[PDB]
Every structure is written in C-alpha cells, then in structure tokens.
Design an enzyme around this catalytic site. Sequence first.
Site, PDB file in Angstrom:
ATOM      1  N   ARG A   1       0.798  -1.211   0.000  1.00  0.00           N
ATOM      2  CA  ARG A   1       0.000   0.000   0.000  1.00  0.00           C
ATOM      3  C   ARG A   1       0.844   1.281   0.000  1.00  0.00           C
ATOM      4  O   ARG A   1       1.366   1.649   1.038  1.00  0.00           O
ATOM      5  CB  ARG A   1      -0.990  -0.030   1.214  1.00  0.00           C
ATOM      6  CG  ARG A   1      -1.862   1.209   1.350  1.00  0.00           C
ATOM      7  CD  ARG A   1      -2.820   1.439   0.169  1.00  0.00           C
ATOM      8  NE  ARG A   1      -3.862   0.423   0.225  1.00  0.00           N
ATOM      9  CZ  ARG A   1      -4.889   0.252  -0.598  1.00  0.00           C
ATOM     10  NH1 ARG A   1      -5.116   1.008  -1.693  1.00  0.00           N
ATOM     11  NH2 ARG A   1      -5.693  -0.720  -0.262  1.00  0.00           N
TER      12      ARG A   1
ATOM     13  N   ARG B   1       1.437  -6.596  -9.518  1.00  0.00           N
ATOM     14  CA  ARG B   1       1.919  -6.050  -8.249  1.00  0.00           C
ATOM     15  C   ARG B   1       2.066  -7.118  -7.169  1.00  0.00           C
ATOM     16  O   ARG B   1       2.554  -6.793  -6.005  1.00  0.00           O
ATOM     17  CB  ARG B   1       1.048  -4.907  -7.730  1.00  0.00           C
ATOM     18  CG  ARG B   1      -0.350  -5.307  -7.449  1.00  0.00           C
ATOM     19  CD  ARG B   1      -1.228  -4.112  -7.159  1.00  0.00           C
ATOM     20  NE  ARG B   1      -2.585  -4.537  -6.964  1.00  0.00           N
ATOM     21  CZ  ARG B   1      -3.472  -4.054  -6.062  1.00  0.00           C
ATOM     22  NH1 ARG B   1      -3.163  -3.071  -5.276  1.00  0.00           N
ATOM     23  NH2 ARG B   1      -4.731  -4.560  -5.998  1.00  0.00           N
TER      24      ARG B   1
ATOM     25  N   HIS C   1       0.029   3.622 -10.285  1.00  0.00           N
ATOM     26  CA  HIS C   1      -0.909   4.114  -9.294  1.00  0.00           C
ATOM     27  C   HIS C   1      -0.228   4.985  -8.210  1.00  0.00           C
ATOM     28  O   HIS C   1      -0.341   4.721  -6.997  1.00  0.00           O
ATOM     29  CB  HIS C   1      -1.678   2.919  -8.762  1.00  0.00           C
ATOM     30  CG  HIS C   1      -2.869   3.235  -7.906  1.00  0.00           C
ATOM     31  ND1 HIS C   1      -2.813   4.095  -6.829  1.00  0.00           N
ATOM     32  CD2 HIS C   1      -4.104   2.674  -7.872  1.00  0.00           C
ATOM     33  CE1 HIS C   1      -3.965   4.077  -6.185  1.00  0.00           C
ATOM     34  NE2 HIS C   1      -4.766   3.238  -6.808  1.00  0.00           N
TER      35      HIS C   1
ATOM     36  N   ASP D   1     -12.688   9.901  -6.511  1.00  0.00           N
ATOM     37  CA  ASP D   1     -12.163   8.799  -7.374  1.00  0.00           C
ATOM     38  C   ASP D   1     -12.529   9.192  -8.786  1.00  0.00           C
ATOM     39  O   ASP D   1     -13.702   8.987  -9.235  1.00  0.00           O
ATOM     40  CB  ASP D   1     -12.727   7.413  -6.957  1.00  0.00           C
ATOM     41  CG  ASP D   1     -11.995   6.238  -7.677  1.00  0.00           C
ATOM     42  OD1 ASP D   1     -11.022   6.567  -8.435  1.00  0.00           O
ATOM     43  OD2 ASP D   1     -12.403   5.025  -7.520  1.00  0.00           O
TER      44      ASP D   1
ATOM     45  N   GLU E   1      -2.671   9.335 -10.873  1.00  0.00           N
ATOM     46  CA  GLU E   1      -2.279   8.101 -11.570  1.00  0.00           C
ATOM     47  C   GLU E   1      -2.194   8.254 -13.079  1.00  0.00           C
ATOM     48  O   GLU E   1      -3.041   8.922 -13.685  1.00  0.00           O
ATOM     49  CB  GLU E   1      -3.245   7.010 -11.228  1.00  0.00           C
ATOM     50  CG  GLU E   1      -3.717   7.059  -9.796  1.00  0.00           C
ATOM     51  CD  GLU E   1      -4.661   5.922  -9.440  1.00  0.00           C
ATOM     52  OE1 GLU E   1      -4.776   4.957 -10.178  1.00  0.00           O
ATOM     53  OE2 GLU E   1      -5.309   5.969  -8.411  1.00  0.00           O
TER      54      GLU E   1
END
Length: 296
Positions: A76, A101, A166, A210, A269
């Site tokens: 994270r 990832r 990201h 978002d 991003e």
Amino acid sequence: SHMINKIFALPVIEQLTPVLSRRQLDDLDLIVVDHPQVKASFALQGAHLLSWKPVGEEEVLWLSNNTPFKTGVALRGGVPICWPWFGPAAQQGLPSHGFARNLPWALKAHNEDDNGVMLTFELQSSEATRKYWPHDFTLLARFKVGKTCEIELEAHGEFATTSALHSYFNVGDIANVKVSGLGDRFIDKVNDAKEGVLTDGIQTFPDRTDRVYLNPEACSVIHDATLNRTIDVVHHHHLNVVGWNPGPALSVSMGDMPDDGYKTFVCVETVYATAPQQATEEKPSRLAQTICVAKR
C-alpha cells in the site's frame, strides 16, 4: 514516512554496487538506492517503487506505515503497477489492479552515474500465471531515479490490457491540496460513474474522490500549501489520468492504511483504462510517468 525510514535503516544483505543494495523487510526482498542525488527504494514483488526522495527535498512518494510486507500481498503506497487490468477484475475472486503487483520480478539490469540510477525489472508469463490470464507476456519496468524520477512500463505479447501507474504522492495535508491540469470532462467512480466537467482543470480533495479524467493535460501539478511545493506529474503513452484519495471512512476500513493515512497523500495516476490497449509482436504497449518537485 517512519516506514520509509525503517527501510533505509535495514541491514545490507548484498552490496550490488556502492549505491545499490538488497535488504529485507519481513517477507520481501527490497532494492534500495542510497545515492548522493537520491534515496529510492523498491520491492522485487511488483517492481514496486516504494519511495523517492531527491536530495534536499521531502519524500515525494507516500508509503503506508501500515502496509504489510508479505509474499503476494499488494503493497500500500509507492507506485503500484496495475497490470494487466486496472480496477476491479472482470471475474469475481480475482483481485483489483491485475497481478503484476503481486508477483516477484527480477532486477534484470542497472547502471549508475553521478546523476542517478537506472533499474530494469522483468516479469514473465508462467504456466502458473496462465491459469488465470491465458496469455504469454514479458513485462518490463524501467526506472531512472535522481533529481527527477522516470517510470516506464512496457508489455510484450499479443493481447489487450488495461493498466495504471498508481502513484501515491506525499503531501502535507490533503486539505491544502489542489491538483491542476486535469482538463474538463471526468468520470466520477464515487458517484455512479457520472460525468462531470471542471471549468479550470483543478480538483480538490475534501473527502473521498475517485476520478478518471478524459482530457487531462500531459502534466498534472500537485499544489501543496503545507509542505510548500509543487509536484509535477508528466504522463506518457496514456489515455486517462486518475486522481484519488480514499477519505477518512475508507482510510480506516482498509487494513493496510492508518486511520489518518488519507491526510497525507493524493494519488495522481497515469492510466490506460477507458479503452483497451493493444500490444502486438511488433508493437508492445507502454505507459510512463515522469515526476519533478520544486519548493515554494
């Protein structure tokens, strides 16, 4: 950034070069760049750029002081490489943001200068990998870290993907943050995917946000009034930019972020998401992000 510090304090397991080493935090091998112009750190897992601090600056990338460092568990913060899909999977029971990832890459190559360090990481399809994404690929991730930071993803094979870098940017207080250069139209994933329109390309982050911007400029700019700096983010080969901060309720829910984690970052991003990106034998798909910082 206690977590970043914990990293640079780890003992050296291999001195690759006077400036590059390999260290270990729980389960995860890291590659750590301690160089006169830059400190940066990476996990082999997900070729995950965990931190980046050009000399004389505050840490540019945010890293959770809560993230696990466990085999196959997503880190994270930093810059998660989201590949070969971006966002929730098509099939229930597969994770958000691909599987790259999650897997170890190989540090295939590296050179250094008086200006900085280049690293190439590689990830190959396997008989393992194919049970859930039935495609051969070779994925490469190349970094140039120094006073600026360049990140370049390259996928070889014959397929469609959707992907993102990201990036989590370190910020003094999400409340004094605005990000400019976002253009006009966006999709609001928090609000039923409705379209909205900025009149000046500036997004603020009062709470959960978002957003998938359809028309951003090449360069997004983070304005940060607490730390007194701007962070330039330059997008290449991309279709969209996304700006995201979870807000307080999600920052608490998430096992891998502190309750107050959202206060101290914004994700800007580099993405390719609202249409598929095709790679072919001749033409690999690419995504790249360049980051600069300047005080005041």
